[PDB]
Design a protein around this ligand. Structure first.
Ligand SMILES: O=C1O[C@H]([C@@H](O)CO)C(O)=C1O
Length: 211
């Protein structure tokens, strides 16, 4: 039986949390229909049994059954791909890095207390780049259908949308038609609904960092 340890909601240890790296792994298992047991970890009060298997406190960690817990959502989703090849979620190498700078540009903008430091323009630039790729190779990152790159980016765009809307009243411009089509499609997938954090918990996860 496959098991995964993921972040719990801040202040709510029995509730699924908002780690986008955790969600990437959960989405992968859900989309590949792999049965798994989810273990919720309060990352501000990690249980000792967990530190024994993840001594650096890394979350998520994945146990494919083969008697070992592995970290790093990149590595984990590759291991899952190898163990459960169908449906294939392989993203072509040429598209692997589509949207790679979006999350970091988002977190900088989110935490920016200077409305004119160019952190917004940076984010738009990356969003613009994503909009161009989907315009040419939509609807997903590999046209159709869904692949690993989508399951990595979707959780991050969810953070961007919810957090920027809440903390800065900022929205992805309507002009970016393909991106809006993209997030609408991805966020409404059964797997995404099942594995996403309630928005209040995502907001709670970011609030201390904003302040
Ligand atoms: O990047 C992340 O988004 C959430 C949020 O809670 C910020 O801490 C978190 O746990 C991640 O590591």
């Amino acid at each position: 039986g496959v098991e995964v340890c993921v972040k719990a909601a801040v202040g709510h240890p029995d509730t699924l949390g908002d780690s986008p790296f955790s969600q990437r792994v959960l989405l992968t298992l859900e989309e590949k229909k792999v049965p798994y047991e989810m273990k919720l970890i309060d990352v501000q009060n990690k249980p000792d049994w967990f530190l024994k298997i993840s001594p650096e406190g890394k979350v998520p960690v994945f146990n494919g059954g083969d008697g070992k817990w592995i970290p790093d959502s990149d590595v984990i989703t590759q291991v899952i791909e190898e163990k459960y090849p169908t449906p294939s979620l392989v993203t072509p190498p040429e598209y692997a890095s589509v949207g790679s700078k979006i999350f970091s540009c988002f977190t900088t903008f989110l935490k920016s207390k200077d409305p004119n430091d160019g952190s917004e323009k940076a984010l738009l630039t990356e969003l613009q780049a994503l909009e161009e790729h989907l315009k040419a190779h939509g609807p997903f990152i590999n046209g159709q259908n869904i692949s690993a790159a989508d399951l990595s980016l979707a959780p991050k765009l969810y953070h961007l949308q919810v957090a920027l809307e809440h903390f800065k009243g900022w929205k992805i411009p309507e002009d970016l038609t393909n991106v809006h089509a993209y997030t609408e499609a991805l966020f409404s997938r059964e797997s995404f609904i099942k594995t996403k954090a309630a928005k209040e918990h995502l907001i709670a996860g970011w609030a201390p960092k904003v302040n």
